[PDB]
Amino acid sequence: AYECGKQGGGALCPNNKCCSRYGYCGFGPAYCGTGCQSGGCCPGKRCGDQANGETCPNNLCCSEDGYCGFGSEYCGAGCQGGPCRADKLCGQLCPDNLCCSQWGFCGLGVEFCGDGCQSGACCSMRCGRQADGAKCTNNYCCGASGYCGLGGDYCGAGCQSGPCT
Amino acid sequence: AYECGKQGGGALCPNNKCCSRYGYCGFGPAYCGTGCQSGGCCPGKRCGDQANGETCPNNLCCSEDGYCGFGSEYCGAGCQGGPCRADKLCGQLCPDNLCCSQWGFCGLGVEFCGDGCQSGACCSMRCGRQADGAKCTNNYCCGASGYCGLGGDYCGAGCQSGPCT
Numbered sequence: 600a601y602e603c604g605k606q607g608g609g610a611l612c613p614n615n616k617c618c619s620r621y622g623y624c625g626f627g628p629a630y631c632g633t634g635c636q637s638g639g640c641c642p643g644k645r646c647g648d649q650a651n652g653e654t655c656p657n658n659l660c661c662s663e664d665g666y667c668g669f670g671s672e673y674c675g676a677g678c679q680g681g682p683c684r685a686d687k688l689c690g691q692l693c694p695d696n697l698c699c700s701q702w703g704f705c706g707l708g709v710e711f712c713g714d715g716c717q718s719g720a721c722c723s724m725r726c727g728r729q730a731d732g733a734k735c736t737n738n739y740c741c742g743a744s745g746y747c748g749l750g751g752d753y754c755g756a757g758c759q760s761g762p763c764t
Numbered sequence: 765a766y767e768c769g770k771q772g773g774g775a776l777c778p779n780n781k782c783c784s785r786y787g788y789c790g791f792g793p794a795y796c797g798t799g800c801q802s803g804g805c806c807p808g809k810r811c812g813d814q815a816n817g818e819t820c821p822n823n824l825c826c827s828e829d830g831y832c833g834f835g836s837e838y839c840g841a842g843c844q845g846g847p848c849r850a851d852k853l854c855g856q857l858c859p860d861n862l863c864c865s866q867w868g869f870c871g872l873g874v875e876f877c878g879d880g881c882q883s884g885a886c887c888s889m890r891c892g893r894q895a896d897g898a899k900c901t902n903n904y905c906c907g908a909s910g911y912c913g914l915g916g917d918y919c920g921a922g923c924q925s926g927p928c929t
């Protein structure tokens with residue numbers, strides 16, 4: 600069975616393994632070369648202002664030249680996406696489902712996704728009848744018990760609001 | 765059909781989606797909370813010196829306190845792993861298959877994985893018959909045609925050295 604990419608339901612490979620053009624995980628030219636879908640593609644996938652605003656898979660950094668990678672060349676000066684070394688303000692959604700903290704910065708972990716989380720992958724953002732009709736952000740679904748999220752547990756049976764199925 | 769984690773062959777979810785304890789992708793407590801395997805877990809997965817050297821899935825940063833996340837609290841001062849803001853030296857392989865450039869820094873993209881790449885997910889490293897019996901680094905497989913890599917095309921039929929078949 601396929602492992603990754605279009606053929607694999609959009610899954611990513613573990614440990615920066617390249618997803619080949621055929622939807623399998625590995626390293627070397629056959630996986631990381633022409634048609635590489637994600638992982639440590641070589642060259643790096645195109646991104647940002649060089650890819651219609653598409654972000655890098657696997658949280659790679661998008662360089663000023665619009666290539667995906669890691670290192671100062673990618674995450675440092677001129678970085679236009681991913682875990683750039685520069686702080687990312689929000690208040691305006693964060694990219695890639697990153698949490699907008701109470702202080703208006705993008706990140707993951709409890710300081711961003713916990714108490715005061717404004718948007719993105721918040722830990723426990725309340726919604727629906729339990730929250731007096733509060734709406735979820737990011738077009739997330741409001742689950743039956745009144746938490747914002749995505750996936751079957753939130754968009755499935757009992758989904759109160761958002762893009763229920 | 766499982767999507768991710770130990771049920772899904774170690775696959776990751778795209779765009780920081782959490783892999784639930786049951787092997788499905790999504791956001792909210794059911795996915796990111798207790799049992800979260802990868803993605804934007806809340807709290808972050810344990811990592812670094814606090815977790816037997818385990819790295820963060822999805823290239824999250826490992827904080828000083830050994831939790832996975834993003835933002836300066838995770839990638840900045842005290843960062844133990846992932847795309848820390850500090851340059852990452854190598855010469856001591858790079859974690860998670862990052863390329864060790866000719867200059868001894870970890871990253872991905874042609875500057876690291878291309879010409880002069882020492883180890884990790886190098887673009888093209890020769891091995892086996894076609895390279896005077898040269899062995900691959902990182903315990904990669906040597907393909908039939910004499911290129912280093914992982915996956916079916918390299919570890920499968922024709923494999924010369926490394927963890928073949």
Ligand SMILES: CC(=O)N[C@@H]1[C@@H](O)[C@H](O[C@@H]2O[C@H](CO)[C@H](O)[C@H](O)[C@H]2O)[C@@H](CO)O[C@H]1O
Pocket residue numbers: 600619620621622623624625629630914915916917
């Ligand atoms: C370059 C490419 O995609 N090659 C694929 C092979 O990967 C694939 O074999 C699969 O390999 C994956 C790991 O890469 C895993 O070992 C699977 O079990 C295996 O099937 C092969 C399948 O026919 O197609 C090649 O084109």
Ligand SMILES: CC(=O)N[C@@H]1[C@@H](O)[C@H](O)[C@@H](CO)O[C@@H]1O
Pocket residue numbers: 686700701702703704705706710711835836837
């Ligand atoms: C949780 C949070 O939002 N913290 C941010 C921090 O990540 C960022 O580096 C800083 C920049 O001034 O602003 C806040 O402290």
Ligand SMILES: CC(=O)N[C@@H]1[C@@H](O)[C@H](O)[C@@H](CO)O[C@@H]1O
Pocket residue numbers: 670671672851865866867868869870871875876
């Ligand atoms: C490809 C490579 O190794 N480049 C490194 C760069 O990442 C690092 O920031 C710099 C520090 O002086 O040294 C080199 O330029």
